[PDB]
């Protein structure tokens, strides 16, 4: 154990892939704060503040706004053991598909918001069978608005463009929805995503809250801090500098010569940019060189786009023009110096 | 909004319920780090050192074994779909039985270490594939995974471990691997798909390939928990949870309270269950604890709610100072409280 026995040590490292994305002070300074307990009033008093924050990125007042204790693949596992009783787009849909299968005109529909894996921010409008939308990738840099879009089910994750860590998922229900939950003759294969259990804990039913699990307190401070971060820049600010930055990505991506995977610079989701691969040139060589020479992490292809993309991120705080210019010159360096058949 | 964009104020609380605890300086400075690659060489490497953590506290050598992104609901949740292809206690034993009701001579049976409902620790010398829930007892009594042959040993982070909760640990016997890799029937979790999960947590042969974001945070600061738990030792941890348990019982006994659970040797150290005072709401002694000590102590679970209060003892926090504080906390408290 003598691995175990030497202090922590963590290098420092530019997050500008799908995800996880690195952490602004506030988040950080949270995530170092003290426990409290996990059935007090002021956890409480956190948890409801994180409902209204839930209910400001939404865009909804459904009363079914909660917390996942889990990934965002938890919130969307969550939502569909809850709502099912026995599309594919990018990696996103073929998930879905296996969860799909693992349980048993169709009654529900799923589509990715923000494909991370395609670099594709697919089309909403009109699409209001329930509506199920993923929001990880999306939420917070393009707008989404529930209750205008009607969308029955939205999910996002808490370490994208919130940019709090990863491990907490953020989900809200329709009245459609919870009708279909609370209207099953069958129990969910699952005790822990039971939603009427959940509900009854975060406070959106009528009893008062039981013990099912114990929340992540921690996580729950960085995301609480996370929540307020966005609600006081503001939701079309942070589209606005999203937007830009993309803009701006794409400018220097094609200038240094490279192809931009998705044509339809309107249909570029702007936290996700996919870029096809340099012709003669090793993914994993280039993926190597930003690591190697610039303490950069971008990202290969998942799924379907495994070996025809690179991946690159513009989360939150890290969406910015400085970060774009150094992801630029590291891939300039990447193209000139990894070896080209 | 007017509530989120007031600053975060959390208030100074001494937990001293069955879990979740107070943290120390240690896991505070982990929880508060900088991001990395949730797929990174350096993630991986703070992966297989909480790997070998799991191996000492379990005391196991099970090459299956990794941390569960989720409660100690989520471990015993993913234990029971994975080894499932469609005995109780207090609570713990109700939720392994609305689990296995959620999906429908026995192939496997369930066993609670340390009942934190009742504070009986209860043998697993003497004991179809083994589950033992370890939440509460792990690191506070003996408990030997490979020696006891146990098939699936399960704990969570929140307890002794001192971690932030929603981790969970994991370790599975040869036989129960076996059982898990030769399933006619897929899972109903992919959450929690075990193939997938031991592929990431570097437990098979093939490369880690993506399944699901690892809490990162979460892992540096389990890293730091185990590495505590390893510096100080496993016979060092399992003495002072007995002397500090000890301690407690004899001065709760000193103020005319009586012990929930009598033989001394079916008493778990970390979580002790106190009879209820007679002619007392056990609602006002918690709030006076809360309200006029800062203090947190606990009520009953399950069955044994309304009937016992409950103490805990984890970790750094089993100190006898913190036994000392809440002994003067419920001495105020039974002189205040309405007696009918």
Request: charged content about 20%; cysteine-free.
């Given at each position: 154990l003598k691995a175990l026995l030497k202090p922590l040590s963590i290098p420092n490292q530019l997050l500008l892939g799908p995800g996880p994305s690195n952490l602004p002070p506030r988040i950080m300074a949270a995530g170092g704060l003290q426990m409290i307990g996990s059935?007090?009033?002021?956890?409480?008093?956190?948890?409801?503040?994180?409902?209204?924050?839930?209910?400001?990125?939404?865009?909804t007042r459904n009363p079914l706004t909660?917390?996942?204790?889990?990934?965002?693949?938890c919130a969307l596992e969550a939502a569909l053991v809850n709502v099912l009783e026995p599309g594919?787009?990018?990696?996103?849909?073929?998930?879905?598909?296996?969860?799909?299968?693992?349980?048993?005109?169709?009654?529900?529909?799923?589509?990715?918001?923000?494909?991370?894996?395609?670099?594709?921010?697919?089309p909403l409008d009109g699409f209001g069978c329930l509506l199920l939308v993923d929001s990880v990738a999306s939420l917070g840099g393009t707008p989404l608005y529930m209750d205008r879009q009607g969308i029955d089910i939205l999910y996002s994750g808490s370490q994208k463009a919130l940019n709090a860590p990863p491990g907490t998922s953020l989900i809200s229900f329709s009245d459609k929805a919870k009708k279909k939950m609370y209207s099953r003759k069958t129990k969910p294969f699952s005790f822990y995503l039971d939603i009427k259990w959940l509900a009854n804990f975060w406070g959106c039913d009528d009893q008062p809250r039981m013990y099912h699990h114990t929340i992540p307190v921690i996580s729950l401070y960085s995301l609480r801090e996370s929540l307020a971060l966005i609600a006081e820049q503001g939701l079309e600010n942070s589209w606005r500098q999203h937007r830009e930055a993309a803009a701006y990505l794409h400018g220097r991506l094609q200038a240094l010569g490279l192809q931009l995977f998705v044509k339809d610079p309107a249909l570029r989701l702007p936290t996700v940019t996919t870029v096809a691969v340099p012709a003669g040139y090793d993914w994993r060589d280039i993926v190597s060189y930003v690591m190697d020479h610039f303490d950069i992490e971008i990202m290969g292809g998942l799924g379907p786009s495994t070996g025809k993309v690179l991946r690159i991120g513009l989360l939150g705080c890290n969406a910015t023009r400085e970060n774009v210019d150094r992801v630029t010159e590291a891939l300039r360096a990447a193209l000139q110096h990894c070896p080209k058949k």
């Open positions: 059935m007090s009033k002021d956890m409480y008093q956190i948890m409801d503040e994180i409902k209204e924050g839930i209910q400001y990125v939404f865009q909660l917390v996942i204790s889990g990934s965002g693949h594919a787009n990018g990696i996103w849909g073929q998930r879905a598909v296996d969860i799909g299968e693992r349980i048993g005109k169709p009654v529900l529909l799923f589509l990715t918001h923000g494909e991370s894996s395609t670099g594709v921010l697919q």
